Amino acid sequence: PMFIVNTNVPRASVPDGFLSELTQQLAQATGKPPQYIAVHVVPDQLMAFGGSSEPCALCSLHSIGKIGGAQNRSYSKLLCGLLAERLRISPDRVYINYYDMNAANVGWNNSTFA
Amino acid sequence: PMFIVNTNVPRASVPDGFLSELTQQLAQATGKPPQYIAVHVVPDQLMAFGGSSEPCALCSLHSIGKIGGAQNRSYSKLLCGLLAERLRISPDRVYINYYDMNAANVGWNNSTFA
Amino acid sequence: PMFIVNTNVPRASVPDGFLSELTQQLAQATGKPPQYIAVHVVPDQLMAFGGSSEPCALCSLHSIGKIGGAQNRSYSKLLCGLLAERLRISPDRVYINYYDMNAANVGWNNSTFA
Ligand SMILES: *C(=S)NCCc1ccccc1
Ligand SMILES: *C(=S)NCCc1ccccc1
Ligand SMILES: *C(=S)NCCc1ccccc1
């Protein structure tokens, strides 16, 4: 999978090691090799959540399968837990959109995963 | 719902109250409490629309239901109105991608909305 | 269509003419008028791919139709081609998510494409 975090937390508040840690914990959570996981963090954003500019995040996780009710709950506990621990973001000011991609609709290395 | 605007309009052209205004207008438009609505504006982008770098916007609106033919036309009229009036972007240089998210595919507060 | 590339390549590495070339190549790949094509490049991103911060990209292409097995393979070869030639990113460090949008789910000019 690939995980993207957009947040109003400033760049200086993103701790060294954070992209690595996200890679490792997503690899572990999905039983996927870490060589396939992509991660992306976008700090310093102009965002509001419930009209407030307190720390918040808008995120996405795309996966070819391994998306569903229990699995997404597990992902959210893991990802909100990381965002709370590392970025000081309340889990109730985070949204994560989950996307179950078809292999034919994921481009990589001049072709797709189909 | 959550609304993201990416634009080549500079940060200084985004009016002070703009995130609050989007929050309140989207709350009114969907009959949702404003506490749930997230909004995110990304200015100064390197983008073109039709090959031109005249002001333009690429947007998304994610909602758990309340997405459909008529609802979406209404959203577009509302959101293009605000982008024209506040950011001085022509409606014919705006795209908005609408996503009807399943509740189980939206993470929040260490779980999902399911 | 609309194509978005997020990359850790620095802004100064993105050559003059890159948005123009993407617009032109996407028009040719879909036979669609360039006047409707939108492109967006986001350099200097904090991203990793396979746990490495070597040059990489995460991309999206949204289109109303013209998405499918052979078409997406063709787009990937085109777009990885450009990202390798112009931004010096290895094709195997690019992901492109493809989205076949329903015309009623794309807003434009105060309405939708339905
Ligand atoms: C996790 S195994 N990511 C690699 C495959 C992929 C899946 C969805 C979107 C992009 C890349
Ligand atoms: C509007 S009520 N937003 C909160 C629920 C939601 C829907 C789609 C994506 C993120 C959050
Ligand atoms: C290509 S012809 N783009 C214009 C129509 C479109 C399709 C998907 C998303 C946004 C805009």
Side-chain angles (χ1 to χ4, degrees), chain A residues 6 44-51 58 67-69 72-73 76-77 80-81 91-99, chain B residues 2 11 14 19-20 23 34-42 62 99 101 104-114:
Chain A
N6 297 270
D44 298 291
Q45 297 300 292
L46 180 64
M47 49 167 65
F49 187 116
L58 300 175
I67 294 296
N72 294 356
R73 284 184 294 267
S76 288
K77 187 184 182 187
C80 291
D92 66 1
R93 285 188 58 75
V94 175
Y95 285 144
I96 304 164
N97 286 317
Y98 290 100
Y99 301 89
Chain B
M2 45 177 284
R11 177 168 186 120
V14 178
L19 295 185
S20 289
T23 299
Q35 289 90 341
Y36 280 97
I37 289 172
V39 297
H40 177 193
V41 175
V42 195
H62 292 76
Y99 299 91
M101 296 303 292
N105 290 158
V106 180
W108 172 64
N109 190 215
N110 293 311
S111 186
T112 64
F113 278 104

Side-chain angles (χ1 to χ4, degrees), chain B residues 95 97, chain C residues 1-2 32 36 62-64 101 106 113:
Chain B
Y95 286 139
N97 287 314
Chain C
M2 48 177 285
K32 283 296 167 55
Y36 287 128
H62 296 77
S63 183
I64 292 165
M101 306 294 292
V106 179
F113 283 105

